[PDB]
């Protein structure tokens, strides 16, 4: 689709239209501090094209916003390559938010979820997070309306054993949380329950097909999900493959190469040879 940069959206909602054609945000997305906004600015607004965030997602003090079901309906993976504190999703002092509605979110690789101080917010205990996050031990969901034992939560849907009882799992009144059979793992499945291809991540339009993933599990290159970037391609942003040329062009006006990865910085013990961008170990001590 489109790959755009990590963005930081504040004050006027109008900045939000930068994302219109975007499919993957390479980096993080932060939408915050909007105090004059009203429900009606959101009841006609959507980003069905956003499928993936590489780093983290953070919503904070966005008023008038009541569900995310129309805003990011098709966001499916958050990869958490870089985290906010230790979180890959932060929902914080989101006054007005009632329900989450990320019914397409299937996996948060790496990070944890922190959803705090959201009076109004329910449909939280109706989510099985362990089907989405690797580590839920570090989840931090407190001080929401859900913690008043007094939530009008209603959903068909399936139940998991999180307590000492099974619990129906859904995002909104009209969307179930999708659960793939245990043995599909993270790879996703069709509505019937045929596992997607093993190099796919959350979902697929067709089964058994590495070009028909909705979000690559390992790395993306030339339409296909692959296990690893072959030379002459390099690991970038830890989700996609690129050639030397791409990596170089970005460096010049601070990207470098090491371990067959294209990265901002040489790691310790290494200095950057100028002829080839390749990090080399130091002759004696490293000035760096």
């Amino acid at each position, epitope marked *: 689709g489109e790959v755009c940069p990590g963005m930081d959206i504040r004050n006027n909602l109008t900045r939000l239209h930068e994302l219109e054609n975007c499919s993957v945000i390479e980096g993080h997305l932060q939408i915050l501090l909007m105090f004059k906004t009203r429900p009606e600015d959101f009841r006609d607004l959507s980003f069905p094209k956003l499928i993936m965030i590489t780093d983290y997602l953070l919503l904070f003090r966005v008023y008038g916003l009541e569900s995310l079901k129309d805003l990011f309906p098709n966001l499916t993976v958050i990869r958490g390559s870089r985290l906010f504190f230790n979180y890959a999703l932060v929902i914080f002092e989101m006054v007005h938010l009632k329900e989450l509605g990320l019914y397409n979110l299937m996996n948060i690789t790496r990070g944890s979820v922190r959803i705090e101080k959201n009076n109004e917010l329910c449909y939280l205990a109706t989510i099985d997070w362990s089907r989405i996050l690797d580590s839920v031990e570090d989840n931090h969901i407190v001080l929401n309306k859900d913690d008043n034992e007094e939530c009008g939560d209603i959903c068909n849907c399936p139940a998991t054993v999180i307590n000492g009882q099974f619990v129906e799992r859904c995002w909104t009144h009209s969307h179930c949380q999708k659960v793939c059979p245990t043995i599909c793992k993270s790879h996703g499945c069709t509505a019937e329950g045929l596992c997607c291809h093993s190099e796919c991540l959350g979902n697929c339009s067709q089964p058994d097909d590495p*070009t028909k993933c909705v979000a690559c599990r390992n790395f993306y*290159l*030339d339409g296909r999900c692959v296990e690893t970037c*072959p030379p002459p391609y390099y*690991h970038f942003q830890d989700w996609r493959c690129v050639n030397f040329s791409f990596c170089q062009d970005l460096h010049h006006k601070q990207y470098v190469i090491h*371990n067959n990865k294209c990265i901002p910085e040489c790691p310790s013990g290494y200095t950057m040879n100028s002829s080839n961008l390749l990090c080399t170990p130091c002759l004696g001590p490293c000035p760096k």
Partner: antibody
Amino acid sequence: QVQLKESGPGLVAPSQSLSITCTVSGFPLTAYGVNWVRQPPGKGLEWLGMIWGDGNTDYNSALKSRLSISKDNSKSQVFLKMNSLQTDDTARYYCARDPYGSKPMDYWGQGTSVTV
Amino acid sequence: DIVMSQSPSSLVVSVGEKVTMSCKSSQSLLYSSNQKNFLAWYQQKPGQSPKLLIYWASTRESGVPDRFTGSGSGTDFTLTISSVKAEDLAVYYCQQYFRYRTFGGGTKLEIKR
């Protein structure tokens, strides 16, 4: 339905060029690589070249521009074109698929015989 | 392209036994970024086109029996067939797919009667 089938002319007189069409079906050429390998009867299997998803090309250095590999992805065809052949080029030619990132060479053609 | 060399040119064996043939490259084939070696083994039952067996020198392809066992790392490789069954007769080749691809000189399996 992953399939490759080679269309060779079969017979070529010396000093003339070789044009083979590998017709693949069941996958998109924009997303996989295609290799060419030949074998003279009961002799070695010989890597000739490959064309990646993005149009990029690899050739055996032995082939001094004797080899040109190009593609028509809209009509699912891969073209090998090799100039001025001699009798030591008498071999069976295969194209085979290449899931580069994830696999090496899965799915082979049945092979086409070419004699000089 | 680099240069690959096998041994032997051919071998012979009978039913029940384990078998190991060799290969070598002029340059190291271990990929740093994932710790996998970029080498393949293919079986070619004779007269028919070859078939994919083992990639990353240890990953078994779908539809391959567990009797087939790939080994080695760096520049030096070997392929192992544990317990021979009748039609296991084939010529086996090593392919590097690290940079470009080149195949080994190949090595033949024959059976005793």
